[PDB]
Design a binder for this molecule. Structure first.
Ligand SMILES: O=C1N[C@@H](c2ccc(O)cc2)c2c(-c3ccccc3)n[nH]c21
Ligand SMILES: O=C1N[C@@H](c2ccc(O)cc2)c2c(-c3ccccc3)n[nH]c21
Ligand SMILES: O=C1N[C@@H](c2ccc(O)cc2)c2c(-c3ccccc3)n[nH]c21
Ligand SMILES: O=C1N[C@@H](c2ccc(O)cc2)c2c(-c3ccccc3)n[nH]c21
Ligand SMILES: O=C1N[C@@H](c2ccc(O)cc2)c2c(-c3ccccc3)n[nH]c21
Ligand SMILES: O=C1N[C@@H](c2ccc(O)cc2)c2c(-c3ccccc3)n[nH]c21
Lengths: 201, 201, 201, 201, 201, 201
């Protein structure tokens, strides 16, 4: 990453490398893996972002889809900012430069700590997370329509499933079971989730 | 977080990220998870507080209730402090800015290290903990009325349960079993818990 | 904690938070948990001491007894030092201020690093350890009178039990078994534990 | 490694040493072990690169092949840059010097931090990774021709295998099973992997 | 401990605290626990040395013997250096001061960093290790006389046992079995252990 | 160790202490334990090298052989450099001084950071590794002559064993099984291991 000591490059740590690999192995593309990726890639250069993605062993269908999303975003960067060199001067980053493909670490360090800074780490991380959210949604096994409360299912457990599915992807009342549904209609409109959950406790 | 080096931003650590996720997985909304959250979010920016909350995989009914509490507190912040920009000047944080929704990391860094400082990390953490205490209370399985000492239950074990339930949520004497209750009445008023626990040992 | 960088505040660490919670879970109120608590709370502010105590999940009968001891010590602090404010000046800490109840972190930082320093961290830690020793003694299952050497028990194992019990709470010779007791009387007075343990090997 | 404090030598860490050894033990020469090696050897001297390779216990057929690749690259370095000494002056690194065989740590430190720098760590790491990719390819058990979708195999699982094999080493459509193949031909040309994977969901 | 930043006090770490406790739990008073104790107590104050000893849960017979050895050494310190105060001046450390019993942390910090330094940490550690070696020897289960090579025991395994016992507490040839003994006598005098071990391989 | 802050002494870490002890316990005197020892003892003083060796619990036959090798090297140091004191001046290190036996930590710190430096840490580490390689070779269970490819053994597995044995201690072709041997002779002379391994795949 780049961090303060002045902004300087620091090695990505064994802890960070390990953390990311393990979260992917344990959680796959569960929605909460996105904020974890983002946190572990704090201050990350494009080389670091590529390093973290490369260390993943499985899920190569997903990694391939991620490359496609990244390519799309790179072509849009080049559409918006066409790259136009003078000796010892900073060059303009194209799409592939931001994705760490055609840029060196020094060039990446140069853009990020420049004044004004060109945050190629954050621009790339945005493309990656955009791609990762597309995968999270695809790998979501259940539609929100299929999430309904079972006759003996505690209301809490049903809501946990409802917003879990919704995160990946008055309907809550519709899909509640008959008993709790009657209690919820009795509360009327403008009832908070807290009040609903207490009412069906 | 923000810490001293001067106040500067530091990345949230893999240890901290991991610690929080594991405590939630192991303890759910047991009362003691609140002080742990608060300690792990020491010096935290709103982005950090959102990051920690986002990394939680389950409990989305609870996370939804937390958003509701946060919204309520945000509307009260905007009621108390209406946001009213001049070039290169610091803007006033509204409710959603404190919750990290409509504020950047730089703006957050700017408010927190300003002189005088606007501690948006602590103001937000207060809203979160307020919401988290509401959940702790809701998920408490047992009422204090139902906590009574069994005929062969050691008095210590009963008191452990009594104050455990009470933390989530002369009654102690009333709910004691006949044998220990007689010993406790014999001690009279103004007996400390220590003396009570020794008397029924 | 407060440590040198100048004396400055540092966040309590995930390692420290975890260490304390695990020692309590594994050892409960075994005597050796007191020196571990004291070591893990090195340089601790009252907020830190409260944080460590709060993160404990079980043992709420004990935590309640601890509050009682702390209250007693707070009332004695207020008896000895009655608190008597001038703008931008340091105020005098009362009992509840030392216990972190009515004091902010800044006020705590202010007292501790002041010249001359008012060590509210150490004064509070003393009250806590005083309370913790009272609990260690209470939860000690065996009296030293009941610790006696079994007919086939190695003398070493018996002494391990004898001083273990004694830590929580020529008697050693009296409670030794007949065979080893005769050997010990033959050594006469002024025999060291080493010589006793060798003589009954 | 060499890192900023000025560029200075730092010891390779127990965490780093352990990380590398464990990844090799768990993953052998799975493709993703290359980016992990590269990340763990960030800022590494030739001595460090040799240290990491030496700590590997098994896979000595592979380590021998790696030496061969390294020798080949060393002979090409000597072909391109023949080494031609003056007292207290820096000497020119030959092939074996870059590979850490005939160079001391001080000489390595000297080349790397020189102005202009001769990055012997990165030049050597390139030779090593070049050798490691040759092994990854050799130890790949399956040809991409043999990767075909089973009649009841989810399309996602088949693509995971397809790009996994391809990483080690409209064919994707050809090797799909009859049912999904018909759906894919119906999409026409220029369909993204995302659309293909959704179409066969 | 005390370390360089100038010599300043640093908190004993959770890693260090944990390491010591675990080594004692796993190895008891195996000989190699002494050098581990010494390494973990590097730069340690008397308070730190007492902290490490206090955190040990079992082995209170041994800890009691350790106190006895320490007392003996303290009385010898007071015999050699009788303590003879002037305002704001450093006082002379007596036996109990070195053992951390009657000395504060500040006084300990004062002696250790004084010029010339009075290394009370090292003087105390010497008393402790002297006591610990006495225990290692006592808890050694086997005499070296009883260590003899079994008829089918590999010579290496026998020598491992021989020097293991010897560490706790031409004899090696005498106690070797008939077959290997004849081979060893054939080597003559002045044969190294290496040659002996090869000869009986 | 000694490291840069200026060259200053730092405590050997719990991580480092633990790492070494565990590698010995898991790998004994497998060849790869030598480079691990060397890496973990980076910047080590003789006291540190002795500390690491002392913390090893088993293998006392080997540790004894190591002392013998060290003694031999010490006598050669004294043969080459006879030690010949002036107040407050640095003395000349003899054999036993380099081995940490008759030298203090301060004297060791003094030699190592002197200008010009006398690297007693590296000179001693060389003696130790020289001794450790002698043990690795001795404890190697299999001769390279006994390593031959089984009739159904994959060629890769055989080569792994061949160079494993060779590390501890056209022969590769001779010891290959009939089928693969014919393929290898057909390749002719000057075939690389890569080509051989592919040819017998
Ligand atoms: O140099 C690299 N550029 C990206 C990359 C590589 C190819 C592509 O079509 C899009 C992005 C990448 C990746 C990568 C790996 C998995 C998912 C996304 C990007 N790894 N290394 C690189
Ligand atoms: O940008 C964010 N703002 C909050 C948030 C998001 C929505 C809302 O109604 C209240 C607060 C939040 C959260 C969040 C997640 C779980 C519980 C509480 C807040 N995560 N990210 C953000
Ligand atoms: O703000 C606090 N003050 C103490 C406290 C709280 C109440 C009391 O009667 C005595 C001390 C405390 C504790 C606490 C918890 C368990 C045991 C001892 C003190 N946690 N937070 C606080
Ligand atoms: O000093 C060294 N130089 C390399 C090396 C050693 C021999 C060779 O033919 C090529 C490279 C090496 C290695 C090594 C070990 C395994 C794989 C590759 C290089 N370990 N130490 C050294
Ligand atoms: O303040 C202390 N002084 C020593 C001590 C305590 C009593 C004694 O007779 C000798 C040394 C000690 C110990 C201690 C504990 C176990 C073994 C050796 C010393 N713990 N705390 C203290
Ligand atoms: O002070 C010491 N000097 C060495 C040592 C001790 C005796 C000897 O004959 C050779 C070297 C050593 C060792 C040691 C232990 C195991 C193997 C090699 C050296 N531990 N402490 C010391």
């Amino acid at each position: 990453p780049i961090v303060q000591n002045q902004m300087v490059h620091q090695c990505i740590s064994p802890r960070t490398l390990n953390a990311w690999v393990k979260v992917v192995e344990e959680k796959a593309f569960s929605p909460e893996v996105i904020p974890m990726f983002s946190a572990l890639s704090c201050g990350a250069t494009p080389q670091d972002l590529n390093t973290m993605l490369n260390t993943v062993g499985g899920h190569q269908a997903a990694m391939q889809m991620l490359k496609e999303t990244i390519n799309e975003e790179a072509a849009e960067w080049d559409r918006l900012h066409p790259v136009h060199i003078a000796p010892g001067q900073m060059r303009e980053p194209r799409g592939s430069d931001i994705a760490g493909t055609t840029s060196t670490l020094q060039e990446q360090i140069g853009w990020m700590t420049h004044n004004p800074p060109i945050p190629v780490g954050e621009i790339y991380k945005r493309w990656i997370i955009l791609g990762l959210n597309k995968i999270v949604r695809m790998y979501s096994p259940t539609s929100i329509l299929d999430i309904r409360q079972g006759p003996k299912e505690p209301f809490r457990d049903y809501v946990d499933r409802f917003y879990k599915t919704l995160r990946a992807e008055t309907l809550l009342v519709q899909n509640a079971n008959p008993d709790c549904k009657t209690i919820l209609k009795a509360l009327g409109p403008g009832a908070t989730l807290e009040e609903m959950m207490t009412a069906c406790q």
